[model samples]
Target: NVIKEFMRFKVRMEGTVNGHEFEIEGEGEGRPYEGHNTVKLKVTKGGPLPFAWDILSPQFSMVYVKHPADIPDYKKLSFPEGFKWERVMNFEDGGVVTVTQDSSLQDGCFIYKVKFIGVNFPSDGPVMQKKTMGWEASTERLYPRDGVLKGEIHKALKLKDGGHYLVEFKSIYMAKKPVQLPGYYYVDSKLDITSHNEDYTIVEQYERTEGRHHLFL
Candidate 1:
């Protein structure tokens, strides 16, 4: 049996809000590094871009390539890593807040793939952008993992005009491999986003290879 040690694909994202439309195209790729898989994503010109573009882009750039050394167990439905989890109360704020950087608990096996589905939730991509934007959000585990990878993001974002601009992003990645160290391959990818609820939504997509994957290819 052979393992596909490396992966590459193109990505595209586009959507419309309140009458304005924007789109972005790019490519990305990743592979096992040390204990985790590293990925790089870029946005192409086809995008007129939206006010929340920065807010929305990273979901693909950072998460789609997420797969730590300690992956979630295929049987278990959740994030991997067994860390400490706790909640502390802030004296300044009356409400109790749960505190734990990246949940202490985390799992996975090379066998069956672990799946994550995120819907209407704040997003924190493993490799976050340098700056901060209004709390990022997404659905179905925005942070993709090493196993069979797929994620869906559907959320409402406010536009520069105060009107609501709805956005949705979906990412799917297939992993089939056992290639030796540095044995990498390429996969063409693309992202497409349009204004629609689900069934009728069409997203056309590709980005360049991510990080070292691009260098080799």
Candidate 2:
């Protein structure tokens, strides 16, 4: 019954990366652990460029676990040791990355903050980098078409150009599923961006709700 309990959801993202407009679709499932659970998402970039184009790449397959105290006791015991309350990202190139989260107050409300650790490449060894992201739940008043809730997110990834490439986004949850489940929801989202390495910057953004839904996006 564990598999059935996993809430599945889909996401469609259209935005600019380094000034180039791009679209991506993703799907994943989440299983409850304690206060937090683990999520595994598969992402594919729309359209094509150089290198491989016909490939359905799982460029986003990774585990994001929440702190045991974040959930209830009944759920906390479900996750095994070493896999509890941590974020681990696995890349197709055999690179493993981890992140830690901290709770912060933004505009008088709680926000999720994360910091990226070093990467462990399968062959090239380890490489350290500085990156951070923050998720702030919306507290602003919304219009009739704005859905149930809205939130803002900011992310910064280390790059060669001053080592500070940023992404800022806003999302709206349009609908909710029948039952309350973890990491599943329907939403419309948008991204606002700037230049990336003086070559490109995010130019557009879109969102699509795919597959079954529960709660959280």
Q: Which candidate is the best by lDDT?
A: 1
Most TM-score-accurate candidate: 1
Writing each residue's lDDT as its tens digit, candidate 1 over 126-178 gives 11211222222333332334544444444334334344434444444332231
Compared with the true structure, what per-residue lDDT tens digits does model 2 show for residues 1-217? 3222344434343433223334544433444221112222222342332211111111121122222232222122222221112244343345444443333222322223233332333333112121211111212111223223333334333333343433333333222222112332222221122111221111211111112222442
Give me candidate 1's TM-score against the actual structure. Answer: 0.29
Q: Would you estimate the TM-scores of all the predictions?
A: 0.29, 0.28
| lDDT values for all models | 0.29, 0.27
In Å, residue 159's CA in model 1 sits off its true spot by: 16
